[PDB]
Coordinates of C-alpha atoms in Angstrom, one line a residue:
Chain A
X20 CA 28.0 220.3 65.7
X21 CA 29.3 217.2 64.7
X22 CA 32.3 216.1 65.1
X23 CA 33.9 213.0 62.1
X24 CA 36.5 211.0 62.7
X25 CA 38.8 209.8 60.2
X26 CA 42.2 207.9 59.3
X27 CA 43.6 203.8 59.5
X28 CA 41.9 201.1 61.5
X29 CA 45.3 199.2 61.1
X30 CA 49.0 200.6 61.8
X31 CA 52.2 198.7 61.8
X32 CA 54.7 198.2 64.7
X33 CA 56.5 201.3 64.8
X34 CA 54.3 203.7 62.4
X35 CA 52.4 206.3 63.9
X36 CA 49.0 207.0 64.3
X37 CA 47.0 209.8 61.9
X38 CA 43.7 210.5 62.3
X39 CA 41.7 213.8 61.5
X40 CA 38.8 214.9 63.5
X41 CA 36.4 216.9 60.9
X42 CA 33.9 219.5 62.1
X43 CA 30.5 220.3 61.1
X44 CA 28.5 223.4 62.4
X45 CA 31.4 225.2 64.2
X46 CA 34.2 226.7 63.7
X47 CA 37.2 224.8 64.3
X48 CA 39.2 229.0 66.0
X49 CA 36.1 229.2 68.4
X50 CA 36.6 226.3 70.3
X51 CA 37.1 226.4 73.7
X52 CA 39.4 223.5 73.4
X53 CA 39.5 220.3 70.9
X54 CA 40.9 216.7 71.8
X55 CA 41.5 213.6 72.1
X56 CA 40.2 210.5 74.3
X57 CA 40.8 207.1 73.7
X58 CA 39.0 203.4 74.7
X59 CA 41.5 200.4 74.8
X60 CA 39.4 197.1 73.7
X61 CA 37.2 196.4 76.9
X62 CA 39.1 199.6 79.0
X63 CA 38.1 203.2 80.4
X64 CA 39.1 205.9 79.0
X65 CA 42.8 207.5 78.5
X66 CA 42.9 211.6 78.0
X67 CA 45.2 211.6 75.3
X68 CA 45.5 215.7 74.7
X69 CA 43.8 218.8 73.8
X70 CA 44.2 221.9 72.4
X71 CA 43.7 225.4 73.2
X72 CA 41.3 228.5 72.0
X73 CA 44.6 229.8 71.5
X74 CA 46.8 227.0 69.5
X75 CA 48.9 226.1 72.9
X76 CA 48.3 222.1 73.0
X77 CA 48.8 219.9 76.4
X78 CA 49.8 216.2 76.6
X79 CA 49.2 213.1 78.9
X80 CA 52.6 213.0 79.9
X81 CA 53.3 209.2 79.9
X82 CA 52.2 209.9 76.8
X83 CA 54.6 213.5 75.4
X84 CA 56.9 212.7 73.4
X85 CA 55.3 210.8 70.7
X86 CA 52.0 212.8 70.7
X87 CA 51.3 216.2 67.8
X88 CA 48.0 217.5 67.9
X89 CA 47.3 220.3 65.5
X90 CA 44.7 222.0 63.8
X91 CA 43.2 223.0 59.8
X92 CA 41.4 226.1 60.1
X93 CA 40.8 225.8 55.5
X94 CA 39.7 222.5 56.3
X95 CA 38.4 223.0 60.1
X96 CA 39.8 220.2 60.8
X97 CA 41.8 218.9 64.3
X98 CA 44.3 216.2 63.8
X99 CA 46.0 213.5 65.8
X100 CA 49.8 212.6 65.4
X101 CA 50.6 209.3 67.7
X102 CA 54.5 208.4 66.5
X103 CA 56.5 205.2 67.4
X104 CA 52.7 204.0 68.1
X105 CA 52.7 199.3 69.7
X106 CA 50.2 197.1 70.6
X107 CA 49.4 198.9 73.5
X108 CA 47.7 201.6 71.4
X109 CA 45.0 199.8 70.1
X110 CA 41.7 201.5 71.1
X111 CA 38.7 203.6 70.3
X112 CA 39.6 206.8 69.3
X113 CA 37.8 209.8 70.3
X114 CA 38.0 213.7 69.1
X115 CA 36.0 216.2 71.5
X116 CA 35.5 219.5 71.4
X117 CA 34.1 222.1 73.8
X118 CA 31.6 225.0 71.6
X119 CA 29.3 228.1 72.8
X120 CA 30.4 227.7 75.9
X121 CA 32.0 226.7 79.3
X122 CA 29.1 225.0 80.5
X123 CA 28.2 223.6 77.3
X124 CA 28.2 219.4 77.0
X125 CA 30.9 218.8 74.8
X126 CA 30.7 216.8 71.4
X127 CA 32.2 213.7 70.6
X128 CA 32.7 212.1 67.7
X129 CA 31.6 207.8 67.0
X130 CA 35.0 206.9 68.0
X131 CA 37.1 204.9 65.3
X132 CA 38.6 201.3 66.1
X133 CA 42.9 201.6 65.2
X134 CA 44.4 198.7 65.9
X135 CA 48.4 198.7 66.3
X136 CA 49.4 194.8 64.7
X137 CA 51.3 193.0 61.5
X138 CA 48.7 191.6 60.7
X139 CA 47.5 192.4 56.9
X140 CA 44.1 193.3 56.1
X141 CA 41.4 190.4 55.8
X142 CA 38.0 191.0 53.8
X143 CA 35.4 188.6 55.3
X144 CA 33.9 185.9 53.8
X145 CA 30.0 186.6 54.4
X146 CA 27.9 182.5 55.0
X147 CA 23.8 181.9 54.9
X148 CA 22.6 181.2 58.5
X149 CA 19.2 179.9 56.7
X150 CA 16.5 178.8 58.5
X151 CA 5.8 180.3 65.5
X152 CA 9.0 182.5 64.9
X153 CA 11.9 180.8 63.2
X154 CA 15.8 182.4 63.2
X155 CA 18.2 183.4 60.3
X156 CA 21.2 184.9 59.9
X157 CA 24.5 185.7 58.2
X158 CA 27.4 184.2 59.3
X159 CA 30.6 187.2 58.9
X160 CA 33.8 184.7 58.8
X161 CA 37.8 185.8 58.5
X162 CA 38.8 189.3 58.6
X163 CA 41.5 191.7 60.1
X164 CA 41.8 193.8 61.5
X165 CA 37.3 195.0 63.7
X166 CA 34.9 196.2 62.8
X167 CA 32.5 194.3 60.6
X168 CA 29.3 196.3 60.4
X169 CA 26.5 194.7 59.9
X170 CA 22.3 195.5 58.9
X171 CA 19.0 194.1 57.7
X172 CA 17.5 195.2 54.6
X173 CA 18.8 198.6 54.8
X174 CA 18.7 199.9 57.6
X175 CA 14.1 198.8 57.8
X176 CA 14.7 195.3 60.0
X177 CA 15.5 196.3 63.1
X178 CA 13.3 194.9 66.1
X179 CA 14.8 191.9 67.0
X180 CA 18.5 191.8 65.4
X181 CA 21.0 190.5 67.7
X182 CA 24.6 191.3 66.5
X183 CA 26.8 189.5 68.7
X184 CA 30.6 190.7 69.3
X185 CA 33.5 189.1 66.9
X186 CA 35.4 186.2 68.5
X187 CA 39.3 186.3 67.6
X188 CA 39.2 182.4 66.3
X189 CA 42.8 181.0 67.5
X190 CA 44.0 181.9 63.6
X191 CA 44.3 185.5 64.3
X192 CA 41.3 186.8 62.0
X193 CA 37.4 187.6 63.6
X194 CA 34.9 185.8 62.9
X195 CA 30.9 186.9 63.9
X196 CA 26.9 186.6 63.8
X197 CA 24.2 188.5 62.9
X198 CA 21.1 186.9 64.0
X199 CA 16.9 188.3 63.8
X200 CA 14.1 186.5 64.7
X201 CA 10.8 186.6 62.2
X202 CA 7.5 185.6 62.1
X203 CA 7.6 181.7 60.6
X204 CA 4.4 182.4 58.0
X205 CA 7.7 185.2 55.9
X206 CA 9.7 183.4 55.1
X207 CA 8.1 182.3 52.4
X208 CA 6.7 186.5 51.0
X209 CA 9.4 188.5 53.2
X210 CA 13.0 188.9 51.6
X211 CA 16.2 188.9 54.3
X212 CA 19.5 191.2 52.7
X213 CA 22.1 191.0 55.6
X214 CA 24.1 194.1 54.9
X215 CA 27.6 193.8 55.4
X216 CA 30.6 196.2 56.1
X217 CA 34.4 195.9 56.2
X218 CA 35.7 199.2 55.5
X219 CA 39.8 198.3 56.2
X220 CA 39.4 195.8 53.3
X221 CA 36.8 197.8 51.1
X222 CA 34.4 194.7 51.1
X223 CA 30.6 195.3 50.9
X224 CA 28.3 192.6 50.2
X225 CA 24.5 192.6 50.8
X226 CA 23.8 188.5 51.6
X227 CA 20.2 187.2 51.2
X228 CA 19.3 184.1 52.9
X229 CA 17.1 182.4 51.7
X230 CA 15.5 179.5 53.5
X231 CA 16.8 175.9 53.3
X232 CA 14.7 172.9 51.4
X233 CA 15.0 170.3 54.2
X234 CA 13.4 167.2 54.5
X235 CA 14.6 165.4 58.2
Chain B
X4 CA 39.8 207.4 90.1
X5 CA 37.5 204.1 92.1
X6 CA 34.9 202.5 90.7
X7 CA 33.3 199.1 90.6
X8 CA 32.9 197.2 88.1
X9 CA 29.4 196.7 88.2
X10 CA 25.8 197.8 89.7
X11 CA 22.9 196.3 89.0
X12 CA 19.0 196.9 90.8
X13 CA 14.9 195.7 89.4
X14 CA 13.5 198.1 87.2
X15 CA 11.9 201.1 88.3
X16 CA 14.3 200.8 92.0
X17 CA 17.4 203.0 92.3
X18 CA 21.3 202.4 92.3
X19 CA 24.3 204.3 93.9
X20 CA 27.3 204.9 91.5
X21 CA 30.6 205.8 93.9
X22 CA 33.7 207.4 92.4
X23 CA 36.1 207.6 94.7
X24 CA 39.1 210.4 94.1
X25 CA 42.2 212.3 95.9
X26 CA 42.2 215.6 97.1
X27 CA 44.0 217.3 94.0
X28 CA 41.2 216.0 92.0
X29 CA 37.6 215.0 93.0
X30 CA 38.7 217.0 96.4
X31 CA 40.0 220.7 94.6
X32 CA 37.9 220.2 91.3
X33 CA 34.8 219.6 89.6
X34 CA 33.4 216.5 88.8
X35 CA 30.9 214.9 85.4
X36 CA 29.2 212.0 85.0
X37 CA 29.0 210.4 81.8
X38 CA 26.8 207.2 80.5
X39 CA 28.4 204.9 77.3
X40 CA 25.2 203.2 75.8
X41 CA 26.8 200.2 73.7
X42 CA 28.8 200.9 70.5
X43 CA 28.4 205.2 70.9
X44 CA 30.3 207.7 72.4
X45 CA 30.1 208.6 75.7
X46 CA 27.1 211.5 76.6
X47 CA 26.9 213.9 79.1
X48 CA 24.3 213.7 82.7
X49 CA 26.6 215.9 85.1
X50 CA 28.6 218.4 85.0
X51 CA 29.9 221.1 88.1
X52 CA 29.0 217.9 90.4
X53 CA 25.5 218.0 90.6
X54 CA 24.2 220.0 87.4
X55 CA 22.5 218.6 85.1
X56 CA 22.3 219.1 81.1
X57 CA 19.4 220.1 79.4
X58 CA 17.8 216.7 77.9
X59 CA 19.1 214.2 81.2
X60 CA 16.3 213.8 83.0
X61 CA 16.2 214.4 86.7
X62 CA 16.5 210.6 87.3
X63 CA 20.0 211.2 87.5
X64 CA 21.3 213.0 90.3
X65 CA 25.7 213.7 90.9
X66 CA 27.0 215.0 94.6
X67 CA 30.9 215.1 96.0
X68 CA 31.4 214.9 99.6
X69 CA 35.9 215.0 99.5
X70 CA 37.6 213.0 97.4
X71 CA 34.7 211.0 96.3
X72 CA 31.1 211.8 94.6
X73 CA 28.5 209.5 93.9
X74 CA 25.7 209.0 90.8
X75 CA 22.0 208.2 91.9
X76 CA 20.0 206.4 89.1
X77 CA 16.2 206.4 90.4
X78 CA 13.4 204.2 88.3
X79 CA 15.9 202.1 86.2
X80 CA 14.4 201.1 83.3
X81 CA 15.5 198.8 80.6
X82 CA 17.2 202.1 78.5
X83 CA 19.4 202.6 81.0
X84 CA 22.2 199.4 80.6
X85 CA 25.0 201.3 80.0
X86 CA 28.9 201.9 81.8
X87 CA 29.0 205.3 84.0
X88 CA 32.0 207.3 84.4
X89 CA 32.9 209.3 86.3
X90 CA 35.2 212.8 85.0
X91 CA 37.5 215.5 86.8
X92 CA 40.7 217.1 86.5
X93 CA 44.4 216.3 88.3
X94 CA 46.7 218.6 89.2
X95 CA 47.5 219.3 86.7
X96 CA 43.9 220.5 85.4
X97 CA 44.0 217.7 82.6
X98 CA 41.4 215.3 82.7
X99 CA 40.7 212.1 84.2
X100 CA 38.8 209.4 84.0
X101 CA 37.6 206.6 86.4
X102 CA 36.9 203.1 85.7
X103 CA 33.7 202.8 84.7
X104 CA 30.3 200.9 86.6
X105 CA 28.5 198.0 84.2
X106 CA 24.8 198.8 84.8
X107 CA 22.6 195.9 84.8
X108 CA 18.9 195.6 85.0
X109 CA 18.1 192.5 87.4
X110 CA 14.3 191.3 85.5
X111 CA 12.1 188.9 85.8
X112 CA 14.0 185.1 84.6
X113 CA 13.8 184.5 81.3
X114 CA 14.1 180.6 79.5
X115 CA 16.3 180.9 75.9
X116 CA 14.7 179.9 72.2
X117 CA 17.3 177.8 70.6
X118 CA 17.9 177.5 67.3
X119 CA 21.0 175.5 66.0
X120 CA 22.8 175.7 62.5
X121 CA 23.5 173.7 59.4
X122 CA 26.1 174.1 57.9
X123 CA 25.7 176.0 54.6
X124 CA 27.1 174.6 51.4
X125 CA 28.0 177.7 49.9
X126 CA 30.6 176.8 53.8
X127 CA 31.8 173.9 53.4
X128 CA 33.3 173.8 49.5
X129 CA 35.6 176.2 51.0
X130 CA 36.5 173.9 52.7
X131 CA 35.9 174.3 56.9
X132 CA 32.1 174.3 58.2
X133 CA 30.9 176.4 60.9
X134 CA 27.5 174.6 63.4
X135 CA 25.5 177.5 64.8
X136 CA 23.3 177.6 67.8
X137 CA 21.6 180.6 68.8
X138 CA 19.7 181.0 72.3
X139 CA 17.6 184.1 71.8
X140 CA 16.2 186.7 75.2
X141 CA 17.0 184.6 78.6
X142 CA 18.2 185.8 82.2
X143 CA 19.6 186.0 84.2
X144 CA 23.6 186.3 81.9
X145 CA 24.2 182.2 83.0
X146 CA 24.0 179.2 80.3
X147 CA 25.9 176.3 79.7
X148 CA 26.2 175.3 75.6
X149 CA 27.7 171.9 74.7
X150 CA 28.3 170.2 71.6
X151 CA 27.9 166.4 70.8
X152 CA 28.7 165.3 67.8
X153 CA 27.2 161.4 67.4
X154 CA 27.6 161.9 70.5
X155 CA 30.7 162.6 71.1
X156 CA 31.6 165.9 73.9
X157 CA 33.6 169.0 72.1
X158 CA 36.0 170.3 74.3
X159 CA 37.9 173.3 72.9
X160 CA 36.8 173.8 69.0
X161 CA 33.7 176.4 69.9
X162 CA 33.4 179.8 70.8
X163 CA 30.6 181.8 71.7
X164 CA 29.2 185.2 72.2
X165 CA 26.8 187.1 74.3
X166 CA 24.8 189.8 74.1
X167 CA 24.7 193.0 76.1
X168 CA 21.3 193.1 78.0
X169 CA 18.3 194.3 74.5
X170 CA 17.5 197.5 74.6
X171 CA 13.9 196.9 74.3
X172 CA 14.0 193.7 77.8
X173 CA 17.1 193.7 79.1
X174 CA 17.5 190.2 78.3
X175 CA 20.8 188.1 76.4
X176 CA 21.0 186.3 73.5
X177 CA 24.4 183.9 72.8
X178 CA 26.2 182.5 70.0
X179 CA 28.4 179.0 70.4
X180 CA 29.5 178.7 67.0
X181 CA 31.4 174.9 66.2
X182 CA 34.3 174.8 63.7
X183 CA 34.4 171.6 62.3
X184 CA 36.5 170.8 58.5
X185 CA 34.9 169.2 55.7
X186 CA 36.1 166.3 56.6
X187 CA 35.7 166.0 59.7
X188 CA 31.8 167.2 58.4
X189 CA 32.2 164.8 56.4
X190 CA 32.7 161.6 59.1
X191 CA 29.8 162.2 61.1
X192 CA 26.2 162.2 61.6
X193 CA 25.0 163.3 63.9
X194 CA 25.4 167.2 65.6
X195 CA 23.3 168.6 68.9
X196 CA 24.3 171.7 70.9
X197 CA 22.6 170.6 74.7
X198 CA 21.3 174.2 76.1
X199 CA 21.2 174.2 80.6
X200 CA 19.5 177.2 82.0
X201 CA 17.7 179.0 85.0
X202 CA 14.7 178.5 83.3
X203 CA 15.4 175.6 81.7
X204 CA 13.0 172.9 83.5
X205 CA 15.7 170.4 82.1
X206 CA 18.4 171.1 79.6
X207 CA 17.0 171.9 75.5
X208 CA 18.6 169.4 72.6
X209 CA 18.3 171.2 69.1
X210 CA 20.1 168.9 67.1
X211 CA 20.4 167.7 63.2
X212 CA 21.8 164.8 60.6
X213 CA 24.2 166.0 57.7
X214 CA 22.6 165.6 55.0
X215 CA 18.7 166.6 55.6
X216 CA 18.9 169.6 54.2
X217 CA 20.3 172.1 51.0
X218 CA 21.1 174.6 50.3
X219 CA 17.8 176.8 48.9

């Protein structure tokens, strides 16, 4: 059983946030509850609301007048509508739900970051950080909103990889770097490709990082 | 619900994380505990005060006394670094959560390996120069990076980012990025980052001269 959030990662102030949770491997009409919980960046968890077996809904009192949670049986999904959003609604939103039994673990979605901002989407530029151990990487610069995902060699390379938290530049755009350390002897024979995906701008890039010609 | 912001101990040791509430939440209702590893959804460790879900090892235990609850973790190991959350129900039987406790593993001191990256010719053509200093696999977190350009101390034009404790060796890594215009970059020769850390007998400097390298 698998829950998956979907919806825009960027929403303008005063507009309505809409998310859907697609439920796989279990009927939506057999759930103890389905619900939403959010987590502002760097902070803790806040319950938004839940819908019970009968369709009865319960909402966080501080959010009640802005929240709608519903179920679509035919699509086996449930949704969240949060109207009149402000910057304070920026958060990772999780869908969650309980199946099979009262004591069973509730399942969670992956969580989806929603940023409320008047700024517009911007895709990143990807630059190489070219190299017994050598370090190499990629600089993913000037994008909005978060997040970007970075992998190396399409997931084949995970050992020694460090992907740093994004930094908010004075320009209001984010930048991120991802690095990996590798044997120096591999630089001449092994290919290193950083795979970058920025979903809000629909930007996907595969960047080969090649050793520089350096005479110091 | 209130939790301490952080707890720490060496590998193999025990920690406890406590959750202070009121007679209206923890006092009346069951307590659960969750582990949230970086970038993932919460995973339930404990429910009904002291019960373990299938697949959770007995290194984790929970108990409840009055209006407080406690999570115990024995045999601390390098995959335990995470945020830990208490959860219960309020007077309205709606979910509430503690603020979370970050667990740090107190491993042995490790000095960083330091790497520096000139800007790519590719970026320079875009009119900007990012100079990156990487500090790899060190402990503890406290580290100082100092940028100098032709021996001039740089202040305010760099940003740094630090990873969470590594899932394999419990170290940190840090990346510091110095931002200059292309015009400014081409006015100077010597670019250096100086690193100070517990594990180093003396500060370590990595540097390059503009003009030494060419893109592949």
